[PDB]
Design a binder for this molecule. Sequence first.
Ligand SMILES: Nc1ncnc2c1ncn2[C@@H]1O[C@H](CSCC[C@H](N)C(=O)O)[C@@H](O)[C@H]1O
Lengths: 478, 16
Amino acid sequence: SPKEILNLTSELLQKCSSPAPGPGKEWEEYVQIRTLVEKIRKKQKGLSVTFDGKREDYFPDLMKWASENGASVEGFEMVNFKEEGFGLRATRDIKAEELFLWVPRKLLMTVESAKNSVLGPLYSQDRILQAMGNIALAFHLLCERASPNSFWQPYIQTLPSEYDTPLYFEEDEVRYLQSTQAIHDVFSQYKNTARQYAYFYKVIQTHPHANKLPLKDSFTYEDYRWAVSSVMTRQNQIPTEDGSRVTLALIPLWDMCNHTNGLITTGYNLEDDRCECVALQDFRAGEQIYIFYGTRSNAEFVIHSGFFFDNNSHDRVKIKLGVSKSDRLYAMKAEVLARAGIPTSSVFALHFTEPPISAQLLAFLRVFCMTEEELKEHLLGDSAIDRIFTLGNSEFPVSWDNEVKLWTFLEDRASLLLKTYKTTIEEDKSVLKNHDLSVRAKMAIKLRLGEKEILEKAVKSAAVNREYYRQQMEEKAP
Amino acid sequence: TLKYPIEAGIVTNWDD
Ligand SMILES: Nc1ncnc2c1ncn2[C@@H]1O[C@H](CSCC[C@H](N)C(=O)O)[C@@H](O)[C@H]1O
């Protein structure tokens, strides 16, 4: 019943437009939303458009389409790589820094091609589509998927039919993330996606500029979950045709590369109007070709990329810290932070790779622990180098007293965070070792384990710095 | 080095 779906989505829109609930209400709100999304989903028949046969059956047509439009198709082939999915495998030796992959702009799906597509009329009227280039790309993808003769059909027919973003997690798979820092961004993703689906289902079914959309016929929640997951796992920022601005884009062929540690070796060539990728390392014939996606955390890889990357050298966990207005020194601390370019309250990161805290966090902690006299002396100074550059540098303390205070705080705070997790490090390792787990469950348990391993490293680093500066104070002659 | 580096799956804001 289309009128029942319209009533259920109206209810879903209102629920997901409520304000954020207080501390400790987030899980039960997520369960409230899952209940209504699942009831809608089980009343619908999955993806509106499906392709018979195997995913690999369509890769030859992708290579042929890419070749005819000026892209590189020589020296690699599309292969199944088990738990990494499909990817590129070298057919011949490829040297590091060798240009081996390129994709002309005509092949890309962009916000610009979305504007000139069947979505164009609705794009020009809808406030959300105009503001959210990633949402516009998602609907561009759904519109072309539902088009029988879309130019990008060879690309769309080779995209995965599902993903491992948390949108696809079962309830108990998300439950593994209770009391983690990452779960809050999982909650947000689910609520955003459900709100957007309900909003656009109403728009597509009622707006006159949507009357000719291929989605007015059928537009299921699974359609929208697939579109946003496709975009978040694969989208890229590229310059516009003249280079004056940037835009979001899906890049066929190149986006089949899987991820490894390294540096970005993909850039846009504006002069030749194409994406270009040089080899991250030497790849021998028969070896998988990897690229480096970007310096993202494992929370970001799980939530936005749908995988957990082992030995992520950029892994980190978010921590929120601020000066309280109850602090009798709030005004002076806020003034010092402003001079340093740091907000009074903000989100920092604790890093896996040494050092565990950045210059920004060290600067904040120093200011947070300054005495009134240290604040006055700092504000009286005016050397440009002392606004932030020395303030965040480990070898330029305010005072040994200040160091002891800030490391004591950081040790206690990282220790406090560890105590709030539902499981310990070794409990997690026992689950991973002795249990048969789904792919998505393993991602969740590895993620919560990784958060705690970072926090314990921060505890031990803060403790040794506290002990070091306490020793320096004790050894100072009286 | 790269005038326009491309980050695969760059994180964007989805809060409309
Ligand atoms: N190192 C890695 N380990 C596990 N999965 C990876 C990975 N690098 C990339 N992926 C997967 O590849 C996706 C990015 S697109 C890369 C091509 C993809 N494997 C495909 O079959 O279409 C991610 O969402 C993730 O599912």
